[PDB]
Amino acid sequence: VPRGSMILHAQAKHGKPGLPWLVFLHGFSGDCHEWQEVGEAFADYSRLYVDLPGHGGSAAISVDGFDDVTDLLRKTLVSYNILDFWLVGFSLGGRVAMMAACQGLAGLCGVIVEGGHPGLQNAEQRAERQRSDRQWVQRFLTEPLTAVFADWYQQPVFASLNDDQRRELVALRSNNNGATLAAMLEATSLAVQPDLRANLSARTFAFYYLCGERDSKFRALAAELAADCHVIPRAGHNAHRENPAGVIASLAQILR
Ligand SMILES: [Cl-]
Ligand SMILES: [Cl-]
């Protein structure tokens, strides 16, 4: 997909005529396949597996911030003539879903966020996240992805995984490019995101949170939100990966 393309790369699967679209957004280092094992259990719905800037088929697409991401995501929906849709976003894709929904997405039915940070409480928290993400960026601009992702999947957010799940994940995310990953990590960093709580509290849309039972970090952040939380048993931060069945049951509760 060209570097100057106005619409993001995505894989579409049509469903029943009367049903809305399920627009799936992956997390950092993922691609449009991420939500496919869970999404393909909702064959009645039309499904849109979007590749975010610096990821998958949208890897040549460089963005400055959430403003560019939202604009591109909006234009991508116009491309598939999507008028009624759900934004289902995981972690980074979760943050791009709340950031986009909060700045107007004509035709949104609701936003389903899985382990997506609503935003840091202040500028002091953001300044220290900038510091941290700049170190991460530097590793993605100098080391083989295999070596970077080994330490990536060792962060306290992934503590609940075993070495075999990590090795499987490290190998999968290596199928990327550190230069585009580092630009998208910097352009949509949590250090540049505002605290979206007051907007989510005054939201015009429907909002639903999913969390892995072992994801203590994002379970605590969800408790602060006036949205239903669906805690997924025997799963960590990536609940749709560890417990596809658990997450399918949560989506049915919400949609059907
Ligand atoms: Cl992951
Ligand atoms: Cl697994």
Author numbering: -4 to 251
Describing publication, verbatim:
Accordingly, we report the structure of the MenH from E. coli at 2.75 Å resolution, along with the structures of two active site mutant enzymes, Arg124Ala and Tyr85Phe, both at 2.5 Å resolution. Structural comparisons of native EcMenH with the two mutant structures, R124A and Y85F using SSM shows they overlay very closely, with rms differences of 0.26–0.61 Å in Cα-atom positions over the entire structure. This shows that the mutations do not affect the polypeptide conformation significantly. In addition, 5–6 residues of the N-terminal His6 tag could be modeled for two of the chains in all the I4122 structures and in all chains of the Tyr85Phe C2 mutant structure. The Tyr85 aromatic ring is packed between the side chains of Ser86 and His235, while its OH group is hydrogen bonded to a water molecule and the catalytic His232 (a C-H…O bond), and interacts with the bound chloride ion (3.1–3.3 Å). For the Y85F mutant, the contact between the succinyl carboxyl group and the phenolic oxygen of Tyr85 is necessarily lost, with the carboxyl group then being positioned closer to Tyr148 OH and Trp147 NE than in the other structures; it is consistently hydrogen bonded to both. In our EcMenH structures, the indole NH of Trp147 and the OH of Tyr85 are ∼7.5 Å apart, well placed to bind the succinyl carboxylate between them, as shown in the docking studies. Mutation of either one of them may not compromise binding, especially as other residues such as Tyr148 and Arg168 could then become involved, but such mutations could compromise productive binding, thereby affecting catalysis. If, as suggested, substrate binding is required before the catalytic triad can become active, Tyr85, which binds to both substrate and His232, could play a key role in activation of catalysis. The structure is not perturbed by the mutations.
